[PDB]
Amino acid sequence: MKKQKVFFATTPIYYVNASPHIGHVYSTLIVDVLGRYHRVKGEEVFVMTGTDEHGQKVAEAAAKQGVSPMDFTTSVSSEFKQCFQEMNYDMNYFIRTTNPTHEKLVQDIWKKLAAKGDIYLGKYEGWYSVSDESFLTAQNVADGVDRDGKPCKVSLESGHVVTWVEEENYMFRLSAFRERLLKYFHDHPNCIVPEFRRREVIKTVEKGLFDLSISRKRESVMNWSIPVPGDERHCIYVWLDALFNYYTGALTRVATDGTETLDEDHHALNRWPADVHVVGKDILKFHAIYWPAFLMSAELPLPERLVSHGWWTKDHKKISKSNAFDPVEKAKEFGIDALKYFLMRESNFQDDGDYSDKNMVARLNGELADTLGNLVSRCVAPKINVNGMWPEPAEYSESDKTLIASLNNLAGTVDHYYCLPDIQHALIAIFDVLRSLNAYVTENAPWKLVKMDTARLGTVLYVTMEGLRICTMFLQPVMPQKAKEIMDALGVPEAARVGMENYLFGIVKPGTKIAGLAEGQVVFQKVTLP
Ligand SMILES: COC(=O)CNc1nc(Nc2ccc(F)c(F)c2)nc2c1cnn2C
Ligand code: MET
Fold this sequence. Notes:
Layout: E1 7-10, E2 14-15, H1 22-40, E3 45-52, H2 56-64, H3 69-86, E4 93-96, H4 100-116, E5 119-129, E6 134-136, E7 141-145, E8 151-155, E9 163-172, H5 178-187, E10 192-193, H6 195-206, E11 212-213, E12 215-217, E13 234-236, H7 238-243, H8 245-251, E14 252-254, E15 260-262, E16 276-280, H9 284-297, E17 306-309, E18 313-314, H10 327-334, H11 336-345, E19 354-355, H12 357-380, H13 398-419, H14 423-444, H15 446-449, H16 454-475, H17 480-490
Parallel strand pairs: 1-3, 1-16, 2-3, 3-4, 10-17, 16-17, 18-19
Antiparallel strand pairs: 5-6, 5-9, 7-8, 9-11, 12-13, 14-15
This protein binds the ligand COC(=O)CNc1nc(Nc2ccc(F)c(F)c2)nc2c1cnn2C and methionine.
Enzyme class: ligase
GO cellular component, one term: cytoplasm
Organism: Leishmania major
């Protein structure tokens, strides 16, 4: 009576100094796809996102607009929740670091790290940037000019003003975890993807680590941060607070009235540790080195997999309102599912993808309409499927059996890619089979069979429709509205859409009614390039 661990995947929790943009939408889509695939696989799933709400920069922003920090972060937090509703994401849980359960948990974790002997009182001497919430070395700082045009120092990474600090702070003995980290990496060859970002991280740890500041003075962050337990002069640094959101989520019990309590430990909810943490390549180091070290100190199971991804450009340039890239607009223009497909198909996680209307139309026209939408039309066409039902197959030929084999072989390939995870190659493998299905319909010419060989027609349509069901089931994670549109048109019963029992050829009963497409209804239609 042992249960499988719940599938648990996370987005980063996002800063609330800006409205949701393409970066947050891409990270959340990746996680939404993984979650949806593991529900299609019939597993228990818990995927989470949320907002990173503490620190000086938020306090100064809430002052500027004369509302309380809590009021400012509630409002920006609500914009993230609204964006993720508009994008048709299925997040199980949306965390805020202002949540009392989270703020208590970070203090409990602080006490665990201290009780282990991993915290000491030291002193930072060097540069800090409120706007980056980051400590900087001398080689990452340069001359610039402040709001008043006075010569000053600036971040080479962000352009922001660099306040110099000579200040006591609590510290974490990261230097002590070098060997424990190298052995985690060595015993877990897939703990980081892509595999090369893993080699680069191993080398960073081999060069040795410095100890981390994990506090700032309460005055610095205007009391908008979690107090250090037992030393109210200091507040817990925003990154330590933020990283432990994933653990808070793993412990979070949500009653049917929406009230949230934390379990005492992770075992009963059976989510921890994460199957996948999804992050932008800029926060990879924090999740690959610092985060496991904190978890080692806290004696918690370590993450299974860290997945990093790139940043989108627009029109080979570099996104700037002055091109702009509003994914909510591009979804109104082309269709939400066509945009989700493009973002998951066009680039791998190693690369910085480039959006252009030209490449968007090439994939919508050439793959979604030409391959998938046209195959659906062919299967539910009244002139081809006269009875509007799944026919009885007759004897399969060698040709028929070659295709059935590729249908049975598809789940292994697609499951392997979704679990890697490599969503781009899952999609390529599904579309290889959708292209095969169109060639198979063409080769068999049902337009002839319908007035010549009813029995052979029954075979060709049964195989094609089963093929289409299998491919569509594996597209539900990426294009959930269009996938449902296809399953409804085909008359695939609800129970046949999800679960590993549906991963093989020959599920749907001959005599099942197809619903078809209504008169003006095309699943994907080619468009012009403007
Ligand atoms: C944001 O990252 C940085 O600023 C990197 N460099 C540094 N980070 C930190 N602490 C830190 C960073 C990330 C965390 F997840 C966290 F819990 C703590 N202390 C630093 C430097 C450089 N000297 N000292 C003393
Ligand atoms: C625990 S993930 C924190 C991520 C951070 N808010 C960022 O956007 O870079």
